[PDB]
């Protein structure tokens, strides 16, 4: 009851993050970095996924918030080689590029040196590590292209 000293004992929503419904990019301060995308490029699908899991678990143990873990579209490139005593290119092998991205935020400037040192020391063979600041273009690169929108935009140009 309101007048009783036990008023408000049942309150619970002040302990819960307000969830009242794409995502705004939060730039970091002078001492903390903003949203960061940790790209993992490799020719082996297992290596890319396994290291992304390792990075995701590493951040949790380091109390670093992980915004989102997702996979970039697979790139398939044909590999052709020139035949001996010939001028014709013949297909040799097919290579698929797999990219895994782990999105983190709130990284401290002083702690960035330690975090980058640990991840680069554990990088598997054949895996490329690239850490970039999150931008709108990178997020928009995960969506299908819209030729119909482009065609209408060309008329306006």
């Amino acid at each position: 009851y309101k007048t009783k000293p036990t008023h408000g004992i049942g309150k619970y929503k002040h302990l819960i993050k307000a969830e009242e419904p794409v995502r705004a990019i939060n730039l970091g301060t002078d001492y903390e970095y903003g949203v960061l995308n940790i790209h993992l490029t490799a020719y082996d699908m297992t290596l890319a996924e396994s290291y992304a899991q390792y990075v995701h678990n590493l951040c949790n143990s380091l109390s670093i918030k992980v915004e989102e873990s997702y996979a970039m579209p697979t790139k398939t490139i044909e590999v052709l080689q020139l035949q001996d005593q010939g001028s014709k290119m013949l297909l040799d092998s097919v290579l698929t590029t797999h990219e895994r991205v782990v999105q983190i935020s709130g990284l401290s400037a002083t702690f960035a040196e330690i975090f980058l040192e640990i991840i680069q020391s554990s990088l598997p063979e054949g895996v490329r590590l690239s850490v970039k600041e999150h931008t709108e273009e990178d997020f928009k690169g995960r969506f299908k292209a819209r030729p119909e929108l482009e065609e209408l935009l060309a008329k306006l140009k």
């Binding site: 309101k2 007048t3 000293p5 036990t6 008023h7 004992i9 309150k11 002040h14 302990l15 993050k17």
Partner: peptide, 29 residues
């Protein structure tokens, strides 16, 4: 009309400033 509580209210030790950084239960047990 209000009356102050006779003692420490529940969940008073919870720091609401760092609610995002606070560890959650995440489980029923």
């Amino acid at each position: 009309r209000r009356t102050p509580p006779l003692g420490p209210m529940p969940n008073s030790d919870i720091d609401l400033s760092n609610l995002e950084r606070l560890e959650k239960y995440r489980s029923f047990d």
